[PDB]
Each structure stands twice: as C-alpha cells, then as structure tokens.
Amino acid sequence: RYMRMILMFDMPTDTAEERKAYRKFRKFLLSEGFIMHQFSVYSKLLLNHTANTAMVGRLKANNPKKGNITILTVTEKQFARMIYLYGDKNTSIANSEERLVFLGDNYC
C-alpha cells in the first residue's frame, strides 16, 4: 500500500555554514518530492516499503549533520485520519495517490 513519510527538522542558522547546510537540505528535499505540509515539516508519498527504505537510505546519504531532523513513516490510511483543527488540506495531486490524474476536464 501507499506509504507517507513526514520529515521534521530544526536547523541552526547562526553560521554561514549552517545556512549553507539548511539551503542545500531544502533543495534536496524539494528535488526528491517533499510537499510542504507546514513550515519546517515536509511529506513524501511512497508507493511501498521498498521506496521508503530507498528514501531513508538517500536521506542518510544526504544527511546535513546539523540540527534535529526526524522521520516518521505512516500508512496512507493513517495519514488520512489526520484531524485538521484549522486551515485547509492541500488538494494538489502530489498529496493525493490517484493513479489516473486529470489536469482539466476529468470527463466525468
């Protein structure tokens, strides 16, 4: 089944090297397909546990080694049970897991 993967990070910004690490890590996270759930919180949709293992391996390879960075993997059913006290859910297809995606008329 489809996995979801939430990465939460707090990184120092005191030194220019730390800001380099933060910028490069954000670039990597966006390039690998992480949607901003909130500020400093990112989510990625994975097809299966093999993708999750590959992605955690890639993250360990590209670990900035600064700040506090944690990962939690939850099933898509578990992620769908998330309660929204306020704000609006992100309705982009990147969050959704539909195989057949229509940009425009859905013929329905």
Partner: protein
Amino acid sequence: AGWRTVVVNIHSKLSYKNNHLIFRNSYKTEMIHLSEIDILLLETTDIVLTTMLVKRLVDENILVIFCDDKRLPTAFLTPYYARHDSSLQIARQIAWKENVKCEVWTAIIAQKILNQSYYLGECSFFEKSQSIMELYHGLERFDPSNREGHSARIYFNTLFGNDFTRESDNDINAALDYGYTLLLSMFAREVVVCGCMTQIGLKHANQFNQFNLASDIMEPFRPIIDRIVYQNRHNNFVKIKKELFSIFSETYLYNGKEMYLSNIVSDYTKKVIKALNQLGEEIPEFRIL
C-alpha cells in the same frame, strides 16, 4: 518510470523545476514529481511546452503522447538512447534467428487467440469460444492458414454483431483504435527501454510500420482494450475513452501476481526480449482468465 498517469486537457504552460512538472494554468499552479509520472498525455492542442521539460521527461522514460485537434493521439516521443548498452542490444537484435522469431511469434499469437477464446467463454458466449479454441489448434508456425485472422473475425462478429467489421467507421471501432494506440505507445516505449528497436520485428520480414516489434508483442494484450470497449458499447465516445483510461488504474493477474498494466507490460517485454536475443529464457504467459 512511475505510477501516475497525467492527462492534460486545458490551455496551460508546462515547464520544469527541481525534478517537477510545473503545470501553470492561469487559474492554478500544480507541481508533479517526475519520478511519479508514468504517462503524460496532452490531448488539448493549446498546451505550451518547453524543451527542457521534454529532455527531462525522456530522461525518466516517461511516455509523452501528443494529440490532434480531435483529441486523438497523433505522435509520441521515443528516446534515441534509453538503454546504456543500447548498441549491444541492437546488434543482438540484428542477429535474431528466424527460427526463434517464428517460434516466439507462434507462442504469442497462440496467447492472443487463447485470450480471445477465454473472453468469449466468460462472456457467456460459449459456442464461439469453442470455435476459436479449435482454430487455435489448427494454427502452426507462421500461421499459414491465417487462423489468427479467422479467430479475430469470429471474435469481433460475436462481440459486436456479424455486421461489425474492423474497417468500419462506427464509434466503438474508433474506441478500439484509441485503445490500441494507447497500448502500442507503452509497448513501443518498453521495447525501446529494453535497448531494442521497434522497426525490426518478428514477422513480415522487417516490413516495418516503425512499430512492428511493439505491435507483435501487443497481441496477447489486445483483449484488455477489447473488453472495456465491448462492455461500454452503448455509451458515446467520450465515456468509452473515460473507461479506457482505467487500464492505467486496474490490476491484472499476471504470473501469479496482481500487477498494474505498466509493470505487466514492462516485465512481459523484458522476458520476450530476453527469450529472443539470448535464447536464455522462457516465453511469458499473459492470461485474461
């Protein structure tokens, strides 16, 4: 090389940024990771593309299917270089033995006829299924008696009426034409990814429509489209196309596995190519049962 099939219908601009397909309509901006996209299908003739996005799409082996003014597919991108050892695969393809090619084509045409017979069997049309099964036994190497044509004729006449023919311009025939050029695109992409060429195929002695190998491998998989077109024979073309788009979201039983059509097509193509070029594999089996 992913799961999402992306269909674009509205005037917009398609761009690239950080491994993403940047879709920027005047109303919405919407980003899709390139790893997820498997097929990109641009029906509307108002989409504005960029060349860097095209390069990145062909880098990830993403099928890109352009469409005409009537929203029917007209062309599709295939990469020159899809496999690292492409030269070796092409050289091995050039040296394909005629005996092995004939044997594998016989196997796949038997698979096609058998799938047609099974579909007629499950369709509660028992009688014609037995006739197709009988025609299957009469088939031999290279099909001298054209039993494949006879099976197709009885199949179509039983499903769509005796008056129906493949060359007719009726709506459900355009539906099959749309379906078969959606399967052919994926099969051509997979045979290119395997390093081979679509031009040189098993049959017709290299008399090529540029999709000879893909059209030859497609044969067992045409009942997939034929079933969807058949059970929606009453609906109009748009509804039948909408239902045809469900091959990208439906799981089919292949090799004792419930795999989606993309994976089945990929694995079948790879196994057929490995059975041909190296003679070190067994012919695959796809069953519509």
